[PDB]
Amino acid sequence: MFFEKIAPYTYRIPRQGKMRVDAVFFASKEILKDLEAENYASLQQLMNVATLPGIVEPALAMPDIHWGYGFPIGGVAAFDPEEGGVVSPGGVGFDINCGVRLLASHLTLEDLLPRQKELADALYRLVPSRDVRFSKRELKEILKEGAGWLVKRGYGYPEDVRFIESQGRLPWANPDKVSERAFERGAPQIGTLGSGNHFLEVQYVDEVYDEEAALAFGLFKGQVTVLIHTGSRGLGHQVCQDYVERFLKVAPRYGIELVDKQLAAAPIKSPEGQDYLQAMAAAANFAFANRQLIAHFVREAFEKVGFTPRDHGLRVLYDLAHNNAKFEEHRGRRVLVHRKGATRAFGPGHPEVPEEYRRVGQPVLVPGDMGRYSYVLAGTEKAMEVSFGSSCHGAGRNLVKELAERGILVRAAVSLVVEAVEGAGIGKKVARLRPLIVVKG
């Protein structure tokens, strides 16, 4: 008995103990049952987040919330620099800007199926797990400029950048704050998916829920899409490690009390805070470039098997991060929003949303597990009010053997979450995507 319901699929944990503000989480009657069986562990983590300095009410968690490092996965936490706010690597997650890019083509399922094998083989061959390399000075510029650096040199279409969150460039990146180890560890990984839950999949739209948003996003049933899921690879992971320990060994000076050491944080305005933010931005820009490069190779794979540029017309529908901290305008102020396993989800009328989509809201890409359904949602006005314009990132909670039985070629080297999100009013359903080909890193 430590949280009341304030709206459909919306629960509040009133401020208690060390909490500086209330916490609010979105969930189903069914999801609550899941958390309850978990002793509410992830919620305790959400409550810990609320103990941090300068936090803006309320600390939040999405319907797919679960145990994480310090901050819970599925968490959103805004911090005000002017109020002595802090920045926490654990609030972003180790894979900085691990995210998703969705390409939308002119092809229909019927057009693709007969070349399904050729494409799978071309994708596995053209997408590293080949001979494209950059100099250290070049990848240094990449860390600062983002996806646009690659597009301007031919690794994409001119318009690609318009459909990437923040145009694929966080403004504060500074490679100087990125350790040598992080730099060398991720530098030769650009253009690769990586391991773990990273992949690329060719899919088709099997259901359309909002005709107006679908039209605006250029989506139609039977349409072929390609979803790319990957991040900053080893570079972002290292940057997180470098700063967590640096933040731990300087936490005394600042007097920041941590109920959980994994909540390691530093004042946003402190040298250490500023450095991490600059290095994190560099890692994010690297992740943006990585997805941009992969998209370039995807286009090369379609063409290699016979689909000309005008046949496939593979355009970037959208590209957004699932782990990131960004400075944004909320409540008339500039605040730093930590999102770990949650997405930015701006709504109708927002200047940061491409004009093409401005009337319906920002696309929200919700990948499922490999070989599972993916969804496309749209950001809402309500989210701008109640979740710092944030939405969910996930759809769920013998490996490849059963994938070949559901009609899915693999190349290796009803969502309750979406239901809760739409029910809470922070993510309008637009479409569902079914996988045909899965390429793992």
Q: Which amino acid is at 8?
A: P
Strands 99-108 and 223-230, sheet pairing: antiparallel
What residues contact 163, with CB distance under 8 A and at least 6 apart?
Answer: 315, 316, 317, 318, 319, 354
Biggest alpha carbon distance in the chain?
A: 64
Residue 393 annotated as lining a ligand binding site:
yes
In three-state form (DSSP H/G/I as H, E/B as E, the rest C), the secondary structure along the chain is: CCCEEEECCEEEECCCCCCCCCEEEECCHHHHHHHHHCCCHHHHHHHHHCCCCCECCCEEEEEEEECCCCCCEEEEEEECHHHCCEECHHHCCCCCCCEEEEEEEEEEHHHHHHHHHHHHHHHHHHCCCCCCCCCHHHHHHHHHHCHHHHHHCCCCCHHHHHHEHHHHCCCCCCHHHCCHHHHHHHHHHCCCCCCCCCEEEEEEEEEECCHHHHHHHCCCCCEEEEEEEECCHHHHHHHHHHHHHHHHCCHHHHCCCCCCHHHCCEECCCHHHHHHHHHHHHHHHHHHHHHHHHHHHHHHHHHHCCCCHHHHCCEEEEEEECEEEEEEEECCEEEEEEEECCEECCCCCCCCCCCCCCCCCCEEEECCCCCCCEEEEECCHHHHHHCCCEECCCCCCCCCCCCCCCCCEEECCCCHHHHHHHHHCCCEEEEEEEEEEEEEC
Enumerate the β-bridge partners of residue 330.
Answer: 333
Residue 174 annotated as lining a ligand binding site:
no
Residue 200 annotated as lining a ligand binding site:
yes
Residue 369 annotated as lining a ligand binding site:
yes
Obtained via which technique?
Answer: X-ray
* Rounded CA separation 159/374 (Å): 24
Residue 72 annotated as lining a ligand binding site:
no
Q: Name all domains of the chain by residue range, CATH numbers in brackets.
A: 2-441 (3.90.1860.10)
Q: Would you name the residues annotated as active-site residues? A: 393
Q: Crossing angle of helices 116-126/271-304, nearest 10°?
A: 140
**With contact defined as beta carbons under 8 Å apart, do 112 and 202 qualify?**
yes
Residue that is written with structure tokens 């901290």 in the block: 325
Backbone φ, ψ for residue 402 (5° rounding): -75, -10
Residue 97 annotated as lining a ligand binding site:
no
Residue 394 annotated as lining a ligand binding site:
yes
Enumerate the β-bridge partners of residue 108.
Answer: 223
Residue 145 annotated as lining a ligand binding site:
no
What residues contact 367, with CB distance under 8 A and at least 6 apart?
Answer: 100, 227, 229, 374, 394, 395
∠ Cα 355 326 333 (to 5°) = 85
What residues contact 255, with CB distance under 8 A and at least 6 apart?
Answer: none
Q: Which amino acid is at 129?
A: S
Residue 80 annotated as lining a ligand binding site:
no
CA distances from 378 to 168, 227, 317 (A): 19, 17, 12
Which long-range contacts (C-beta less than 8 Å, at least 24 apart) are formed by 138-143?
139/183, 139/187, 139/190, 139/286, 140/175, 142/190, 142/285, 142/286, 142/289, 143/173, 143/175, 143/178, 143/282, 143/283, 143/285, 143/286
Residue 128 annotated as lining a ligand binding site:
no
Residue 129 annotated as lining a ligand binding site:
no
Q: Which amino acid is at 292?
A: Q
Residue 296 annotated as lining a ligand binding site:
no
Q: In a 10 Å sphere around its CB, with 0-12 CB exposed, 13-18 middle and 19+ buried, how is residue 368 labelled?
A: buried
* Rounded CA separation 441/436 (Å): 17
**With contact defined as beta carbons under 8 Å apart, do 403 and 371 qualify?**
yes
